[PDB]
């Protein structure tokens, strides 16, 4: 019609990722996933076993921003993939008087739904299994008459079996959990009948060794470890679990996966954000606290891991822990921190110049470290962890770079690297060196080119659905966090006193030019 | 004067319009070319080298010779006062008439380079001449050197490269001819000699042809072709095999389950049984190309990348191989197609009765070294199959933990014809929400580095290889035999009568004997 030329917006589209590869301006690249690029508008669109039973779904603080901007929505998305029972309840949970719960149904949550809102009204039908609870997480009376609500809709069920199951999010801060859990233990227990409970818990997961350890120990007469469900925002990204697959269902990457192999492994976490405002609270967790020792280690737990006895999800946590226990704890020598001042052109304000930080704290935006794992497959293996906010590119993978083969080609070739990225585009490519096709020459013209592979809901649905099939592969257990926290805390205890401090590095930057003097110095080669 | 200038490309003009009615089927085609040529053009060092090819009356020099020197004309591989000679027995009288029809009518392409063949065959002459006469051979040096001589460059001489598109049964009088008539200049200059494919039959049959050749040229000067050699993946085995440590640290029998190397024609014998029935597809195909791939894939790490080291190293791998017997072989004679589109091979009138000559083989072949112990090696080969395939299936041992059977062996194969293509086949969990850890599926990781454009034919390497002096990817005196002791056995067995060849009908896979004898040496089939 008039003025509608979106292919200018359309076209840009294409360029992103065009400049994300740069592949030998392959012709076929720019078609083949024009196509693909296309059929992604082509392809969208608006168990057997847990109709069995009734489902209770309570969210704990639903006024709470992450209840309303992901936690329901994630629900929301769940329940048009069908992957909810069609007699399922929602509750909300809070202690904010709210009346006429549908104007706080279709106005404060409709503002947050996902963005096929025009593509469907299922929402309406949706907000119709979603009630509100107005009470205290410190009152066991109050959770008494929760239980009546919620019995009053167990046995509102129209199937056979008997009682319910309760799946409890903790959509509140980390102080609330212990008294949270207690009132559910003395106050809403599931039936006697029949049916089981699950706790979802949101991080932050404590601050150091000592910290975390008494959380897990104020949960530890409620729940147990099959009942308490960690969520990691990161352990439900399809590569992530991906990588169990490709290192153990394959002879080719298990018989490289070691030391004898491994040059360098590389886990980096990249933001193009600041905290842009809000950076008050995050002044106290750090990036170490807040992507490092949780997501990061999380990786490198499944890409260090010895191969699980079975595929079941306690077999995989059990070598995950083993690997974890081989790690020394990081010294201030290994780590360099980032703090982000201003952009040069002034578009992202600097860390300091926000209002809500105390000016003149140290805390890191910014920080590179190198693990070490002391295990026969992993002896003398430079493990890198990088991560930092307001950088050059948004990135989340790893790189890991095998041991060169030095002798027959020697300056013909370079390391081989297989990549793994999860954040903005999933991709899996194996770089190596190939002959140049164009003629003959003397066997040593030579280029570095890639192996590319071929090939419902988001990595945050994906866990909350793994929570209701009891799959508590990805979220991390009571003994694996504690090993985690040990290899963490002394290194920032030392970040706390000082020991080490950050380096300036303005916005857009890759970061201080030491972190990549430090990376090129802990077994890290560049080629362009 | 300019006059003159108009009228020679007009003849140019027609000599690109006379190349393909000689090819295609009439009179409209050649005026629809036209209107194609219109606007198909309009859109806008150090020495004197000699190439003489013997027996240029013959196909091989006019179908892929000459049209591979053109080749490399335009693409500058060639100096610019490069003399070409073809010399034969037979009579021709038109001097340019041979030159402008019978070799420019296969040349490509067409339209886009057919003034570039103008000025290419301004560098070829014919020599009419016998290959066992000293005085033609006195004749030829002549004319030779009197235009090496108005050769205008710093060295003196000239090199002189010769290629010998004759029968094997006169190669011993040509190279005689060449060291007592036709030497190189002994101002400066080297000789080579390309050697075309039927180095004997056996052992013994190459190891008296060799023989023959040695008083008049070492091992540096004679350059035995192999047309698979400079293949584009298989000049690449080398590369990834040790340019990559991935690659390299699985190249073993703790991590190789079983190689095959397949060799597959939908084509028949072509009513020329008669010369077919005295090879066979093993003398063909599998002792020569089958045999130098295998080399490829199988040899240990080069001291380095000169050409006499992976030429040794493929030797030495071969010397680690068992001769063939008849009880790791099967044969197969195919017959007439069910369709009837392809004739049996007894079909032809050249063929004689009751002839045991096989046209389909496969077998399996022992490499009894540290990296290759236990592994089976399958060479196949075969006339009128399925579909035309060149390939390499390197299958991976089956790690069942902890996958069992959501997990199948890895492969790692290698196509060069039809199309070339390298891709890992692995499995990985299918992209999906229910579908779990243990819900998986085959998919590939294939070598995707294509160009822009994306192309040269593997003799292009292989004459320019010889021009620079290269000889990594041509078959050496102690590669042939170390080659010829492996299958000798076998072939007298065959020859004796002892193994006879199973039918099968033009358009399958071959006998199910050899398929049951694939599935007995290693192969797993998945789905
Ligand atoms: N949303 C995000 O982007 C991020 C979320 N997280 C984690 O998710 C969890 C929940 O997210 P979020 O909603 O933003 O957290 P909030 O601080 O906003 O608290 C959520 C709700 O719980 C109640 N609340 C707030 N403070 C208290 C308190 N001392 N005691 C009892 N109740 C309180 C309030 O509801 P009411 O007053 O009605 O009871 C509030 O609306 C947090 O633990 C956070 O660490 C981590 C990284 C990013
Ligand atoms: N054609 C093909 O597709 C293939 C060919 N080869 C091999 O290359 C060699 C040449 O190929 P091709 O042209 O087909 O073979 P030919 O039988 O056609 O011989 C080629 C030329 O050499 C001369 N010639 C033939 N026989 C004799 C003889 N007893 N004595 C002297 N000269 C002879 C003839 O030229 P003149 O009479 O003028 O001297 C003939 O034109 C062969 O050995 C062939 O096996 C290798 C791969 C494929
Ligand atoms: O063995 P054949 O059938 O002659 O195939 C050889 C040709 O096959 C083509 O695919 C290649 O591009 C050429 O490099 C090569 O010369």
Same mark, same amino acid.
């Given at each position: 019609? =008039?003025?509608?030329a ?5 076209l840009?589209?294409?360029?992103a990722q ?6 030998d301006?392959?012709f076929?690249?720019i078609s ?10 082509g392809?969208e ?11 209770? /779904?309570?969210?704990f603080?639903?006024s ?5 901007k992901?936690t ?9 993939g ?5 007699e ?5 949970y809070?202690?904010?008087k !709210?009346?006429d719960? @549908? ?6 949550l409709?503002?947050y739904?996902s963005?096929?809102?025009?593509r469907?009204?299922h929402?309406?039908?949706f907000?119709?299994?979603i ?12 959770f008494?008459?929760?239980d009546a ?6 046995n =509102?069920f129209?199937?056979?079996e008997?009682?319910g199951?309760?799946?409890?999010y903790?959509?509140?801060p980390?102080?609330?959990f212990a ?5 559910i233990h003395?106050?809403?227990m ?5 049916g089981?409970?699950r !706790? ?9 060794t ?11 007469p409620?729940?147990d470890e099959?009942?308490?469900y ?9 590569m992530? &679990?991906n990588?169990? *697959?490709?290192?153990?269902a ?6 490289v996966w070691?030391?004898?192999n491994?040059a360098?492994?590389?886990?980096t976490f990249?933001e193009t954000?600041?905290t842009?405002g ?5 002044d106290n /967790?750090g /990036?170490?606290?807040? !992507?490092?020792?949780?997501?990061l280690?999380?990786i490198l737990?499944?890409l260090?891991?010895?191969k +699980?006895?079975?595929l079941?999800?306690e077999?995989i ?10 790690? @020394?704890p990081?010294t201030?020598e290994?780590?360099?921190?980032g703090?982000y ?5 002034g578009?992202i304000?600097?860390?300091?110049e926000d ?8 805390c890191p $935006? ?12 992993? =002896?003398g ?8 906010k307001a950088v @050059?590119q948004?990135? !989340?993978?790893?790189?890991?770079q095998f041991?060169?083969?030095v002798h027959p080609?020697?300056e013909?070739? &370079?390391?081989?690297?297989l990549?793994?990225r999860?954040q ?7 770089k190596? $060196?190939?002959?140049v +096709?164009?003629?003959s020459?003397?066997?040593?013209? *030579? ?9 419902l809901?988001? =990595?945050?649905?994906?866990?909350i659905?793994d929570?209701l099939?009891?799959n ?8 694996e966090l504690?090993v985690?926290?040990?290899?963490? *805390?002394?290194?920032?205890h030392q970040?706390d ?7 300036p590095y303005?916005?857009?930057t ?7 003097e430090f990376i090129?110095?802990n077994?890290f080669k560049?080629?362009?």
């Amino acid at each position: 019609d =008039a003025y509608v030329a979106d292919v200018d917006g359309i076209l840009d589209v294409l360029r992103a990722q065009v400049l994300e590869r740069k592949p030998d301006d392959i012709f076929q690249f720019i078609s083949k996933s024009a196509l693909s690029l296309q059929k992604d508008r082509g392809a969208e669109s608006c168990k057997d076993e847990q109709k069995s039973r009734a489902l209770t /779904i309570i969210v704990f603080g639903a006024s709470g921003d992450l209840a309303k901007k992901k936690t329901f929505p994630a629900l929301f998305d769940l329940y048009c993939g069908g992957l909810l029972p069609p007699e399922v309840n929602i509750i909300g949970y809070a202690r904010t008087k !709210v009346d006429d719960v @549908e104007k706080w149904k279709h106005e404060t949550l409709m503002k947050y739904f996902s963005n096929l809102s025009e593509r469907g009204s299922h929402a309406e039908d949706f907000l119709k299994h979603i009630s509100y609870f107005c009470g205290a997480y410190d009152s066991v009376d109050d959770f008494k008459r929760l239980d009546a609500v919620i019995r009053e809709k167990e046995n =509102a069920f129209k199937g056979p079996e008997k009682g319910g199951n309760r799946l409890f999010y903790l959509a509140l801060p980390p102080s609330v959990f212990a008294s949270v859990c207690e009132s559910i233990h003395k106050g809403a227990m599931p039936q006697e009948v029949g049916g089981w409970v699950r !706790v979802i818990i949101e991080k932050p997961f404590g601050r150091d060794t000592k910290s975390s350890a008494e959380l897990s120990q104020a949960l530890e007469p409620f729940f147990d470890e099959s009942q308490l469900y960690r969520i990691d925002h990161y352990l439900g990204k399809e590569m992530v &679990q991906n990588i169990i *697959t490709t290192r153990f269902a394959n002879r080719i990457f298990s018989a490289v996966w070691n030391a004898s192999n491994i040059a360098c492994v590389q886990i980096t976490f990249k933001e193009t954000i600041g905290t842009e405002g809000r950076g008050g609270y995050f002044d106290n /967790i750090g /990036i170490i606290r807040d !992507v490092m020792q949780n997501h990061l280690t999380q990786i490198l737990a499944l890409l260090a891991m010895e191969k +699980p006895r079975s595929l079941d999800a306690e077999c995989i946590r059990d070598e995950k822990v083993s690997v974890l226990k081989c790690i @020394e704890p990081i010294t201030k020598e290994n780590c360099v921190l980032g703090q982000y001042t201003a952009s040069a052109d002034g578009s992202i304000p600097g860390y300091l110049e926000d209002v809500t930080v105390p000016e003149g704290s140290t805390c890191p $935006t910014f920080a590179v470290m190198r693990l070490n794992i002391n295990n026969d497959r992993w =002896a003398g293996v430079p493990f890198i962890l990088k991560a930092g906010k307001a950088v @050059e590119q948004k990135y !989340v993978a790893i790189r890991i770079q095998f041991r060169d083969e030095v002798h027959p080609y020697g300056e013909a070739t &370079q390391r081989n690297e297989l990549v793994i990225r999860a954040q903005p585009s999933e991709a899996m490519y194996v770089k190596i $060196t190939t002959k140049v +096709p164009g003629l003959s020459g003397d066997l040593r013209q *030579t280029h570095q080119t890639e192996l590319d592979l071929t090939y419902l809901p988001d =990595a945050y649905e994906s866990l909350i659905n793994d929570a209701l099939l009891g799959n508590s592969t990805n979220f991390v257990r009571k003994d694996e966090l504690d090993v985690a926290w040990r290899i963490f *805390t002394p290194l920032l205890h030392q970040i706390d006193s000082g020991e080490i401090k950050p380096i300036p590095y303005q916005a857009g930057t890759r970061g201080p030019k030491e972190a990549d003097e430090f990376i090129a110095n802990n077994g890290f080669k560049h080629q362009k």
